[PDB]
Design an enzyme around this catalytic site. Structure first.
Site, mmCIF file in Angstrom:
data_model
loop_
_atom_site.group_PDB
_atom_site.id
_atom_site.type_symbol
_atom_site.label_atom_id
_atom_site.label_comp_id
_atom_site.label_asym_id
_atom_site.label_seq_id
_atom_site.Cartn_x
_atom_site.Cartn_y
_atom_site.Cartn_z
ATOM 1 N N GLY A 75 5.523 138.156 94.202
ATOM 2 C CA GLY A 75 5.377 138.819 92.918
ATOM 3 C C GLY A 75 5.420 137.848 91.756
ATOM 4 O O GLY A 75 4.415 137.209 91.438
ATOM 5 N N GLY B 183 -3.375 140.636 93.930
ATOM 6 C CA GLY B 183 -3.731 141.665 94.894
ATOM 7 C C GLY B 183 -3.235 143.059 94.557
ATOM 8 O O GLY B 183 -3.961 144.038 94.730
ATOM 9 N N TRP C 258 2.571 131.735 100.827
ATOM 10 C CA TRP C 258 3.111 133.019 101.251
ATOM 11 C C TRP C 258 2.076 134.023 101.745
ATOM 12 O O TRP C 258 2.430 135.110 102.207
ATOM 13 C CB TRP C 258 3.968 133.620 100.134
ATOM 14 C CG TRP C 258 5.301 132.931 100.009
ATOM 15 C CD1 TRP C 258 5.714 131.822 100.692
ATOM 16 C CD2 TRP C 258 6.387 133.299 99.151
ATOM 17 N NE1 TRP C 258 6.989 131.477 100.314
ATOM 18 C CE2 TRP C 258 7.427 132.366 99.369
ATOM 19 C CE3 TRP C 258 6.583 134.325 98.220
ATOM 20 C CZ2 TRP C 258 8.645 132.428 98.689
ATOM 21 C CZ3 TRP C 258 7.796 134.386 97.542
ATOM 22 C CH2 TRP C 258 8.812 133.440 97.781
ATOM 23 N N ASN C 259 0.800 133.663 101.660
ATOM 24 C CA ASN C 259 -0.253 134.550 102.140
ATOM 25 C C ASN C 259 -0.252 134.470 103.661
ATOM 26 O O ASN C 259 -0.250 135.488 104.348
ATOM 27 C CB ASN C 259 -1.618 134.122 101.598
ATOM 28 C CG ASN C 259 -2.755 134.962 102.160
ATOM 29 O OD1 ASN C 259 -2.760 136.188 102.031
ATOM 30 N ND2 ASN C 259 -3.727 134.303 102.785
ATOM 31 N N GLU D 291 1.397 140.331 88.975
ATOM 32 C CA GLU D 291 1.621 141.138 90.162
ATOM 33 C C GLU D 291 2.886 141.935 89.856
ATOM 34 O O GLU D 291 3.588 141.639 88.891
ATOM 35 C CB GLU D 291 1.872 140.223 91.366
ATOM 36 C CG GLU D 291 2.277 140.963 92.625
ATOM 37 C CD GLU D 291 1.163 141.842 93.139
ATOM 38 O OE1 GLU D 291 0.240 141.309 93.786
ATOM 39 O OE2 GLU D 291 1.207 143.063 92.882
ATOM 40 N N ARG E 69 -0.761 130.443 89.828
ATOM 41 C CA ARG E 69 -1.851 130.681 90.763
ATOM 42 C C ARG E 69 -3.037 131.400 90.131
ATOM 43 O O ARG E 69 -4.186 131.160 90.510
ATOM 44 C CB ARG E 69 -1.338 131.454 91.988
ATOM 45 C CG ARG E 69 -0.443 132.654 91.693
ATOM 46 C CD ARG E 69 0.174 133.154 92.995
ATOM 47 N NE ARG E 69 0.773 134.487 92.919
ATOM 48 C CZ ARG E 69 1.966 134.758 92.398
ATOM 49 N NH1 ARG E 69 2.717 133.789 91.883
ATOM 50 N NH2 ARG E 69 2.421 136.001 92.422
ATOM 51 N N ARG F 149 -8.914 138.264 92.492
ATOM 52 C CA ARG F 149 -7.624 138.020 93.121
ATOM 53 C C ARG F 149 -7.510 136.505 93.231
ATOM 54 O O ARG F 149 -8.419 135.841 93.733
ATOM 55 C CB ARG F 149 -7.547 138.646 94.515
ATOM 56 C CG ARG F 149 -6.187 138.426 95.177
ATOM 57 C CD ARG F 149 -6.117 138.971 96.595
ATOM 58 N NE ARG F 149 -4.846 138.603 97.213
ATOM 59 C CZ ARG F 149 -4.508 138.870 98.470
ATOM 60 N NH1 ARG F 149 -5.345 139.519 99.269
ATOM 61 N NH2 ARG F 149 -3.329 138.473 98.934
ATOM 62 N N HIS F 150 -6.399 135.956 92.755
ATOM 63 C CA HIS F 150 -6.205 134.511 92.781
ATOM 64 C C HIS F 150 -6.318 133.928 94.184
ATOM 65 O O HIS F 150 -6.186 134.639 95.183
ATOM 66 C CB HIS F 150 -4.842 134.155 92.176
ATOM 67 C CG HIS F 150 -3.680 134.682 92.955
ATOM 68 N ND1 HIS F 150 -3.312 134.171 94.181
ATOM 69 C CD2 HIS F 150 -2.827 135.703 92.703
ATOM 70 C CE1 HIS F 150 -2.284 134.854 94.651
ATOM 71 N NE2 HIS F 150 -1.970 135.790 93.774
ATOM 72 N N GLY F 151 -6.567 132.623 94.245
ATOM 73 C CA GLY F 151 -6.682 131.946 95.523
ATOM 74 C C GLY F 151 -5.368 131.993 96.279
ATOM 75 O O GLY F 151 -4.313 132.220 95.691
ATOM 76 N N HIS G 292 6.692 143.071 89.967
ATOM 77 C CA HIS G 292 7.910 142.270 90.112
ATOM 78 C C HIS G 292 8.709 142.863 91.270
ATOM 79 O O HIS G 292 9.244 143.967 91.159
ATOM 80 C CB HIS G 292 8.736 142.327 88.821
ATOM 81 C CG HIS G 292 9.983 141.493 88.857
ATOM 82 N ND1 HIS G 292 10.161 140.462 89.751
ATOM 83 C CD2 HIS G 292 11.115 141.550 88.118
ATOM 84 C CE1 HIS G 292 11.349 139.916 89.562
ATOM 85 N NE2 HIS G 292 11.950 140.558 88.577
#
Length: 171
Positions: A21, A134, A13-14, A74, A54, A7-9, A76
């Site tokens: 998306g 994710g 928005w996390n 991810e 990302r 899962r990208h860093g 859309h």
């Protein structure tokens, strides 16, 4: 087939709690750090990655030169891109929580998302590391009978399409 899904860093928005998306956000400073820590923790196998910034950046900082595939993106969210999870209509929250019956306007349905992801995985003929998102990791984990929630910059190895092998998270 041994596949390592990463899962990208983290992005802004996390922490903000917004649906992320296809919106092409960059990694945060911490996200870059998370990516660096992945270097040396992931096996030296052929690499593939979502073409979104990302993901590509995470792959780069992790020490890889992946081939890019939009199929690893991810889902859309369409008109729901950037929407706060908090204010999401209950119907949407439920669909995402149960991972079914989700089709945002101008977006991709969860069914089409799964088809895209699983068709891509089915085509991998040898072990590889996949830099993705994710939702992709969750789709895979859920299909393998497990809770698909993993932190940003973390990874999961699976024997696709049979079982999860290990979940890796670093501090």
């Amino acid at each position: 087939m041994e596949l390592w899904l990463v899962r990208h860093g983290e992005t802004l928005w996390n922490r903000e709690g917004r649906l992320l998306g296809w919106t092409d956000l960059p990694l945060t400073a911490e996200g870059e750090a998370q990516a660096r820590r992945l270097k040396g923790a992931l096996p030296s196998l052929p690499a593939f990655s979502s073409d979104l910034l990302r993901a590509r950046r995470t792959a780069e900082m992790a020490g890889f030169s992946p081939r890019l595939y939009p199929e690893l993106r991810e889902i859309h969210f369409g008109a729901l891109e950037g929407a706060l999870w908090e204010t999401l209509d209950p119907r949407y929250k439920e669909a995402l929580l149960r991972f079914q019956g989700f089709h945002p306007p101008g977006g991709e349905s969860l069914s089409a998302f799964q088809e895209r992801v699983f068709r891509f995985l089915e085509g991998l003929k040898a072990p590889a590391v996949l830099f993705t998102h994710g939702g992709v990791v969750r789709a895979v984990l859920r299909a393998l009978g497990e809770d698909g929630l993993v932190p940003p910059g973390s990874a999961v190895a699976v024997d696709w399409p049979r079982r999860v092998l290990v979940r890796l998270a670093l501090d």
